Design an enzyme around this catalytic site. Structure first.
Site, PDB file in Angstrom:
ATOM      1  N   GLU A  11      71.070   5.534 -44.624  1.00 19.98           N
ATOM      2  CA  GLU A  11      72.160   6.237 -43.949  1.00 19.98           C
ATOM      3  C   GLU A  11      73.477   6.306 -44.718  1.00 19.98           C
ATOM      4  O   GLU A  11      74.461   6.827 -44.196  1.00 19.98           O
ATOM      5  CB  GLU A  11      72.424   5.589 -42.585  1.00 19.98           C
ATOM      6  CG  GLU A  11      71.308   5.741 -41.559  1.00 19.98           C
ATOM      7  CD  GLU A  11      71.005   7.188 -41.223  1.00 19.98           C
ATOM      8  OE1 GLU A  11      71.955   7.993 -41.127  1.00 19.98           O
ATOM      9  OE2 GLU A  11      69.815   7.518 -41.034  1.00 19.98           O
ATOM     10  N   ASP A  20      76.867  11.931 -37.289  1.00 21.98           N
ATOM     11  CA  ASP A  20      75.547  11.811 -37.895  1.00 21.98           C
ATOM     12  C   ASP A  20      75.005  13.220 -38.113  1.00 21.98           C
ATOM     13  O   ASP A  20      75.606  14.192 -37.657  1.00 21.98           O
ATOM     14  CB  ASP A  20      74.591  10.962 -37.043  1.00 21.98           C
ATOM     15  CG  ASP A  20      74.297  11.571 -35.681  1.00 21.98           C
ATOM     16  OD1 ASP A  20      74.878  12.616 -35.337  1.00 21.98           O
ATOM     17  OD2 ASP A  20      73.472  10.990 -34.945  1.00 21.98           O
ATOM     18  N   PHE A 104      65.434   0.777 -34.964  1.00 25.44           N
ATOM     19  CA  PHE A 104      66.858   1.030 -35.152  1.00 25.44           C
ATOM     20  C   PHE A 104      67.203   2.514 -35.136  1.00 25.44           C
ATOM     21  O   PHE A 104      68.308   2.896 -34.747  1.00 25.44           O
ATOM     22  CB  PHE A 104      67.340   0.414 -36.462  1.00 25.44           C
ATOM     23  CG  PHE A 104      68.769   0.725 -36.779  1.00 25.44           C
ATOM     24  CD1 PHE A 104      69.794   0.021 -36.173  1.00 25.44           C
ATOM     25  CD2 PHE A 104      69.088   1.733 -37.675  1.00 25.44           C
ATOM     26  CE1 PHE A 104      71.113   0.308 -36.461  1.00 25.44           C
ATOM     27  CE2 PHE A 104      70.403   2.027 -37.966  1.00 25.44           C
ATOM     28  CZ  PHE A 104      71.419   1.311 -37.358  1.00 25.44           C
ATOM     29  N   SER A 117      49.658   5.765 -34.077  1.00 25.96           N
ATOM     30  CA  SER A 117      50.033   5.410 -35.433  1.00 25.96           C
ATOM     31  C   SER A 117      50.116   3.905 -35.553  1.00 25.96           C
ATOM     32  O   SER A 117      49.664   3.322 -36.537  1.00 25.96           O
ATOM     33  CB  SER A 117      51.378   6.028 -35.798  1.00 25.96           C
ATOM     34  OG  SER A 117      51.329   7.437 -35.759  1.00 25.96           O
ATOM     35  N   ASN A 132      49.743  10.120 -39.025  1.00 32.65           N
ATOM     36  CA  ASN A 132      50.148  10.219 -37.626  1.00 32.65           C
ATOM     37  C   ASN A 132      51.626   9.898 -37.391  1.00 32.65           C
ATOM     38  O   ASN A 132      52.244  10.445 -36.478  1.00 32.65           O
ATOM     39  CB  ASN A 132      49.266   9.313 -36.768  1.00 32.65           C
ATOM     40  CG  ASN A 132      47.854   9.837 -36.639  1.00 32.65           C
ATOM     41  OD1 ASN A 132      47.594  10.769 -35.880  1.00 32.65           O
ATOM     42  ND2 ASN A 132      46.932   9.244 -37.387  1.00 32.65           N
TER      43      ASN A 132
END
Length: 162
Positions: A11, A20, A104, A117, A132
């Protein structure tokens, strides 16, 4: 070399509050403050999170501290889930930090939302687990980051982050 030394790669890093890529207001590394259009709500939730009237700027140690508060929110948060815990067990720690990146990122509920998955991860069918994790609330959101994390599952190493 792990989750902190992962998301910081994921990030970037601004001490300042910022939008964001989805346009939700944010400060720090991946630390959502509010989805609300009002930035002042973000500054206020920041005011509670830091305990002072930061007004969009903080000492870097507070950034590291809040970053740790969020990563710790991820670590009393993955454990409560009925599904994630065995998968968090099955992962090598290098992938466990990836699961921490997931919870997160999309939130715990969405990581809960990829049940197949995860079932492939605990069974360590890593390839189809990756295919997946790839059929999209996460992979469509941040396709490059999601590719880096799914590759992080594929490899057992940080190589996607190179």
């Amino acid at each position: 070399m792990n989750i902190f030394e992962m998301l910081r790669i994921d990030e970037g890093l601004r001490l300042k509050i910022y939008k964001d890529t989805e346009g939700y207001y944010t400060i720090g590394i991946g630390h959502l403050l509010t989805k609300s259009p009002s930035l002042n709500a973000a500054k206020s939730e920041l005011d509670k999170a830091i305990g002072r009237n930061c007004n969009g700027v903080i000492t870097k140690d507070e950034a590291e501290k809040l970053f740790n508060q969020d990563v710790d929110a991820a670590v009393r948060g993955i454990l409560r889930n009925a599904k994630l815990k065995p998968v968090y067990d099955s992962l090598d720690a290098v992938r466990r930090c990836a699961l921490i990146n997931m919870v997160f990122q999309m939130g715990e509920t969405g990581v809960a939302g990829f049940t197949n998955s995860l079932r492939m991860l605990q069974q360590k069918r890593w390839d189809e687990a990756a295919v997946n994790l790839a059929k999209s609330r996460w992979y469509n959101q941040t396709p490059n980051r999601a590719k880096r994390v799914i590759t992080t599952f594929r490899t057992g190493t940080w190589d996607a982050y190179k």
